[PDB]
Amino acid sequence: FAKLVRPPVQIYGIEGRYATALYSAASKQNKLEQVEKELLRVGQILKEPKMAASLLNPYVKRSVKVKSLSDMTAKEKFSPLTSNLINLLAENGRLTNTPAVISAFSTMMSVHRGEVPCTV
């Protein structure tokens, strides 16, 4: 028993658009490095057992836990193109399957290089 198939998960659209709808502004600047490298942090933070008890703790609050995030946003890598996606990632509670959103960034971060007036 307990067979299960466990369908694949990594890319979809709505979740992938989150990064593309945040880095979209980042691209205009070229912070893909500060938003793609940062996004990688959110992935390791979820793998952290101790983090799971903080990134998903209903004991904190709706606007309280967001403050503690800054500590992981100003001492991890975030701050610029991730000092907004951080609150958004922990605004509704999408810090469970967020690692999938970061992956899309790697594919969306490569489409920005071609989507530019290549005259030089």
Swiss-Prot record:
Annotated positions of the N6-succinyllysine modification: 67, 77
Ligase as UniProt keyword: no
Modification after translation (UniProt): Deacetylated by SIRT3.
GO BP field: proton motive force-driven mitochondrial ATP synthesis
Residues with the N6-acetyllysine modification: 31, 37, 47, 50, 77
Keywords (A to Z) from UniProt: Acetylation, ATP synthesis, Hydrogen ion transport, Ion transport, Membrane, Mitochondrion, Mitochondrion inner membrane, Transit peptide, Transport, Ubl conjugation
Subcellular location, record wording: Mitochondrion; Mitochondrion inner membrane
GO molecular function: proton-transporting ATP synthase activity, rotational mechanism
One Gene Ontology term, aspect cellular component: mitochondrion
Family: Belongs to the ATPase delta chain family.
Subunit structure: Component of the ATP synthase complex composed at least of ATP5F1A/subunit alpha, ATP5F1B/subunit beta, ATP5MC1/subunit c (homooctomer), MT-ATP6/subunit a, MT-ATP8/subunit 8, ATP5ME/subunit e, ATP5MF/subunit f, ATP5MG/subunit g, ATP5MK/subunit k, ATP5MJ/subunit j, ATP5F1C/subunit gamma, ATP5F1D/subunit delta, ATP5F1E/subunit epsilon, ATP5PF/subunit F6, ATP5PB/subunit b, ATP5PD/subunit d, ATP5PO/subunit OSCP.
Physiological role: Subunit OSCP, of the mitochondrial membrane ATP synthase complex (F(1)F(0) ATP synthase or Complex V) that produces ATP from ADP in the presence of a proton gradient across the membrane which is generated by electron transport complexes of the respiratory chain. ATP synthase complex consist of a soluble F(1) head domain - the catalytic core - and a membrane F(1) domain - the membrane proton channel. These two domains are linked by a central stalk rotating inside the F(1) region and a stationary peripheral stalk.
Stated name of the protein: ATP synthase peripheral stalk subunit OSCP, mitochondrial
Organism name: Bos taurus
From-to range in the entire protein, with total length: 24 to 143 of 213
